[PDB]
Amino acid sequence: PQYSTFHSENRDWTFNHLTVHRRTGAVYVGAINRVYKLTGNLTIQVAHKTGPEEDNKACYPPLIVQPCSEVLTLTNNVNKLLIIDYSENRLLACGSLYQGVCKLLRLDDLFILVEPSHKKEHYLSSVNKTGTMYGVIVRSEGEDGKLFIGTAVDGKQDYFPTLSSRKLPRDPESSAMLDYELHSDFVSSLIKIPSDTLALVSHFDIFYIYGFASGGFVYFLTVQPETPDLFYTSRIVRLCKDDPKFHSYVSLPFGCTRAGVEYRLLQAAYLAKPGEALAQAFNISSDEDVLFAIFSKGQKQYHHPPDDSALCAFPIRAINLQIKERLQSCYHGEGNLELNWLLGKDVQCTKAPVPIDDNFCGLDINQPLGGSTPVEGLTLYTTSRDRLTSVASYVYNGYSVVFVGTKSGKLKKIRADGPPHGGVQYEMVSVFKDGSPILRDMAFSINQLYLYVMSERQVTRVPVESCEQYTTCGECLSSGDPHCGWCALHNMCSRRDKCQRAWEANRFAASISQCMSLEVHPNSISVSDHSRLLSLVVNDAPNLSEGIACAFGNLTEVEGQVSGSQVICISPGPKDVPVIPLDWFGLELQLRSKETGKIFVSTEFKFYNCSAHQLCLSCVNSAFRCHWCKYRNLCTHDPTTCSFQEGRINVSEDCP
Numbered sequence: 001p002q003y004s005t006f007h008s009e010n011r012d013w014t015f016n017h018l019t020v021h022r023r024t025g026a027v028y029v030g031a032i033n034r035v036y037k038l039t040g041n042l043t044i045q046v047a048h049k050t051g052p053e054e055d056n057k058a059c060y061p062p063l064i065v066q067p068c069s070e071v072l073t074l075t076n077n078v079n080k081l082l083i084i085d086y087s088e089n090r091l092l093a094c095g096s097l098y099q100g101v102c103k104l105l106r107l108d109d110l111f112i113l114v115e116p117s118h119k120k121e122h123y124l125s126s127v128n129k130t131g132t133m134y135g136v137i138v139r140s141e142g143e144d145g146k147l148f149i150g151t152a153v154d155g156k157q158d159y160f161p162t163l164s165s166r167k168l169p170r171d172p173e174s175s176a177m178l179d180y181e182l183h184s185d186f187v188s189s190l191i192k193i194p195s196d197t198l199a200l201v202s203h204f205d206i207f208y209i210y211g212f213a214s215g216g217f218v219y220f221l222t223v224q225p226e227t228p229d230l231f232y233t234s235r236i237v238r239l240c241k242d243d244p245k246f247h248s249y250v251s252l253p254f255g256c257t258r259a260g261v262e263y264r265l266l267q268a269a270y271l272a273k274p275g276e277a278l279a280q281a282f283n284i285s286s287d288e289d290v291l292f293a294i295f296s297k298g299q300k301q302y303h304h305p306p307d308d309s310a311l312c313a314f315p316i317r318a319i320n321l322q323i324k325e326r327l328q329s330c331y332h333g334e335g336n337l338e339l340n341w342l343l344g345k346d347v348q349c350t351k352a353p354v355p356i357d358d359n360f361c362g363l364d365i366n367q368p369l370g371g372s373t374p375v376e377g378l379t380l381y382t383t384s385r386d387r388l389t390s391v392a393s394y395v396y397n398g399y400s401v402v403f404v405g406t407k408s409g410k411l412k413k414i415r416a417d418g419p420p421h422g423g424v425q426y427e428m429v430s431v432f433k434d435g436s437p438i439l440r441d442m443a444f445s446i447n448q449l450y451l452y453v454m455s456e457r458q459v460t461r462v463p464v465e466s467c468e469q470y471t472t473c474g475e476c477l478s479s480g481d482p483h484c485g486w487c488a489l490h491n492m493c494s495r496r497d498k499c500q501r502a503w504e505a506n507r508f509a510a511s512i513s514q515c516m517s518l519e520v521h522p523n524s525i526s527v528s529d530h531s532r533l534l535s536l537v538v539n540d541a542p543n544l545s546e547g548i549a550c551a552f553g554n555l556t557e558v559e560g561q562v563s564g565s566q567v568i569c570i571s572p573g574p575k576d577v578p579v580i581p582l583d584w585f586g587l588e589l590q591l592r593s594k595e596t597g598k599i600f601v602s603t604e605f606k607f608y609n610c611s612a613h614q615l616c617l618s619c620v621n622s623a624f625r626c627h628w629c630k631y632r633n634l635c636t637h638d639p640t641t642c643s644f645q646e647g648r649i650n651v652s653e654d655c656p
């Protein structure tokens, strides 16, 4: 029962992030003091060292720019960001060490290509806590490359922008590597947290949980304290892929609701395709993007979110639409921009006869833009105690399958259907024996047979499917597991492509109705009536012509005669018939395929003892075919053994 696994070199060097190379299958783990490159089965190939190093967070600029007067401590370098830059066959890794500098590593050997560190913005943030920074690389065909990066700033609002866009030139040795995409006094590709907002509210900060590119936009999902107990707000922040001025900035709350509970604290997210049921539920094409998200109940307890948590789905289209409607109503002069932490105050929308296209990327007016009314997601599934902590999803055979990690190291497999049910958990695996919470980063092997999952101490490769755990066609085809069918002749629950000869008639059942059944006649015989010929019919069967054998429980196995779906077998002989405990005795009559060697169907077969009854009424009312011999004064299965034909009694009505 043991999956492939990789452990941290040390109990304090916890794992942070994880990514799999879509083309190579190479596995990259971002950890404290280490960046690891691993094989598919999690065999380490390269261990790139990133720490520890003597440092102090008070040291700004960093030690690599300036000598520091502060006392230094050997400091752990937390992986804050880990992203594959596919176009350029390299990996971007940014730690917490030295105010959050970054490295570019070559994919094959993790040899350092460059480490930008002369410019102020080359330092992303001194924050040493995971789950607070996220990046997205965007490189079209005619562009050298771009990096969007959002991060908590820890109150150092003048040191670090909370969101920005940087140059990711193709050439590693470019002097402009990681420079602001645009940098001027009052127009830059960056957002800074106003000093007045930290003054008003501390410890005000903005946490970037997830980010993604979809269509012509980038999206960041954030949590931050609300501004005039502490209440937090989870938001969708959108920008156009092509907008140095950051004029396209817009920000809406989001979350979801079910059964009298509001889930507003964002925990995790993952962009995927809908699957057929959600596509219909959402009225979108099956290859449009859907955001799968985990939220905890309420808007409080950010550092220790309630156990009560939910898996929700947001179609990107529904998001863009609610954003467009917001833009439109603002450019009609309705209401305010409503983004107090940034604008600092109430700013009124400006009416202007500008057409708001699907791909409107902002102007000078009416930006940045907030809003109060939340984007509501579709709640798929909820839990009450084993708090959900991560999420990944993909589509198998038109079914959206969602994997959800829990705080106790469990992995749930949810099958997504639209309303009215939403989602159905069809399995839960125990992944980490130590009960360690599952971290946010999960990723599939290149052909989606496995899902890589991590705790702070461990990376584990978990099979997407374990169909063989279902041992009857009934269990298999009612599990609700999209991967699982019944391999008829091998008596096995498996993937179609794992079932030999699946393409041949009735070899593979995809539906409970396609499960074989077995009819026997007669379905019961007198114990004294041995060596009977029985007629077995196999419903919904495949070719049996290779050969069939009949097994009478443990007692017997004889070669059957096969004609289509009909089998004829000889019942056990005198020595082999079972003895009855004092009226009958049941057992499973089974067919073994000679082609495969496996028992694949069964049904009950009963032996009875008419002699067991010693009174006419008892004999006659037997569940089995018994006859009372009036004169011989006994019960029998064979009426021709009564003394006279006149002695035969079959019904109780004429019992003496």
Ligand SMILES: *[C@@H]1O[C@H](CO)[C@@H](O)[C@H](O)[C@H]1NC(C)=O
Residues within 6 Å of the ligand: 039, 040, 041, 042, 043
């Ligand atoms: C699996 O494990 C062995 C251990 O050395 C390794 O050689 C092999 O490359 C691994 N297979 C993969 C995932 O490529």
Ligand SMILES: *[C@@H]1O[C@H](CO)[C@@H](O)[C@H](O)[C@H]1NC(C)=O
Residues within 6 Å of the ligand: 075, 076, 077, 078, 128, 129
């Ligand atoms: C983050 O900073 C705090 C400051 O007190 C420190 O205690 C903690 O160990 C740090 N986490 C790291 C460097 O792993």
Ligand SMILES: *[C@@H]1O[C@H](CO)[C@@H](O)[C@H](O)[C@H]1NC(C)=O
Residues within 6 Å of the ligand: 283, 284
């Ligand atoms: C999606 O849903 C709406 C409402 O049912 C429908 O009018 C529309 O035609 C559907 N798809 C298209 C073509 O936009």
Ligand SMILES: *[C@@H]1O[C@H](CO)[C@@H](O)[C@H](O)[C@H]1NC(C)=O
Residues within 6 Å of the ligand: 554, 555
């Ligand atoms: C067959 O079944 C009987 C009980 O029904 C058992 O006592 C016997 O050991 C079994 N024979 C085997 C397993 O070969």
Ligand SMILES: *[C@@H]1O[C@H](CO)[C@@H](O)[C@H](O)[C@H]1NC(C)=O
Residues within 6 Å of the ligand: 527, 579, 580, 581, 582, 609, 610, 611, 612, 613
């Ligand atoms: C039928 O029942 C009688 C007892 O009523 C018993 O003596 C006889 O052995 C039974 N036949 C069996 C169990 O084979």
Ligand SMILES: [Cl-]
Residues within 6 Å of the ligand: 300, 301, 302, 303, 304
């Ligand atoms: Cl808290």
Ligand SMILES: [Cl-]
Residues within 6 Å of the ligand: 424, 479, 480
């Ligand atoms: Cl179900």
Ligand code: NA
Residues within 6 Å of the ligand: 506, 514, 540
């Ligand atoms: Na069939």
